[PDB]
Design a protein around this ligand. Sequence first.
Ligand SMILES: N[C@@H](CCC(=O)N[C@@H](CS)C(=O)NCC(=O)O)C(=O)O
Ligand SMILES: N[C@@H](CCC(=O)N[C@@H](CS)C(=O)NCC(=O)O)C(=O)O
Lengths: 221, 221
Amino acid sequence: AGKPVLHYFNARGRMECIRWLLAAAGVEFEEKFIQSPEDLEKLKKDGNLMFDQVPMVEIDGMKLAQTRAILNYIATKYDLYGKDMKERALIDMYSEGILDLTEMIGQLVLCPPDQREAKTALAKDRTKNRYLPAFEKVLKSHGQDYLVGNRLTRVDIHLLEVLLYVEEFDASLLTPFPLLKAFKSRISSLPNVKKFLQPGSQRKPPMDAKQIQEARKAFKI
Amino acid sequence: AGKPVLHYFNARGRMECIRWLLAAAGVEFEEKFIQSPEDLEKLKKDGNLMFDQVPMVEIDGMKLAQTRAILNYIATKYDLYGKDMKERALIDMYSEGILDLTEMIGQLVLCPPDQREAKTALAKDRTKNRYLPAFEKVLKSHGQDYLVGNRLTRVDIHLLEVLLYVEEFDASLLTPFPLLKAFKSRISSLPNVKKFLQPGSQRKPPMDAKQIQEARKAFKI
Ligand SMILES: N[C@@H](CCC(=O)N[C@@H](CS)C(=O)NCC(=O)O)C(=O)O
Ligand SMILES: N[C@@H](CCC(=O)N[C@@H](CS)C(=O)NCC(=O)O)C(=O)O
């Protein structure tokens, strides 16, 4: 095969971080969108999904499922996983923290009006007092342009991506962090990244209250 | 330093998969248990926890947090991560499915009482119709003793461990799967595993009801 094929709904979800990593690596990919329960059913019946779930990416002869397994394979393949196990330990701990932040904010648009109020307050609290400070500290610790090993790795991309989501959430959360503001602007200028950020790329938008309801009355939800 | 130091509550939680990997690898470790919230607070205040969370393991000079980061580092260090990136893709995909299954069962203990029965029936349904069939198939596909690469890897250990929890959950779920029954017995006989399974090892038991709430009437949440 030529281009990796990404199987997922036409939405951000768990596949967006993979789109970002391939984009950053400069690797062109195709997407086969799951538009209906029938598309999903067919994917399962034809033996495409190990645990009957997506994300699933066809690459180098594999039908690879599980977000993290896919990200790990792609980062290794395109030299975005650092130079050794020690740098990989830092890249992994940092990336896992970013995934947790992403989920904590991402779950909000699901909270029952009686729950969201406090959950949002907790997320903003965690964002400005737990996560942003941790990454601002990493940058401050070595004063280098990238998070690990003074060279671009997958986690610089994951961090840029989640900062964008933090900005969509509450732009003010980011103000106390000068080093993250600089980092965000630096990574966004990389050629491959700038191209993904441009209108018309395969980058996905966030989903508005209604929009989602559809997807519920679109599949099991 | 010397032995790895594991920072966690005196319970299974997210640290158990890590205790299991080190035991299988024949690596001796120490544990510093978090007995009270005052214990946890100190760990945070002293800056040893990147995101003020545990599991955290002191190994090779690092204060490594995030379960998956720790597991990936330990697996690579002790040659339990396969031989190449393709093997690691399968290892990762399989392990993520195991982690998902583990969480699905484990979280039941936290369900609001009015949701627990529905949640439990789903977890049982997923266990017998999605996860166990998927792993039985991997073993049947190549007919070999191990899941990946015809050689012991971290995921063989992850699978033995989650098979034990499935047995605790509902032993009847495991009866229709012959190759998994055989796999379980086989991995259980390896020297280092048999020793971890024996009484008096650092392996952890499930928490009981009173214990679950008591641990609640103990910390925050
Ligand atoms: N831990 C898996 C979770 C995947 C997952 O939950 N996929 C959902 C949509 S996000 C799915 O495909 N559900 C269909 C089904 O369970 O039948 C991963 O990160 O890839
Ligand atoms: N995604 C993290 C989750 C860590 C986590 O939730 N740790 C909990 C106990 S299992 C904690 O330390 N909570 C204390 C706090 O949030 O203040 C990991 O896998 O290591």
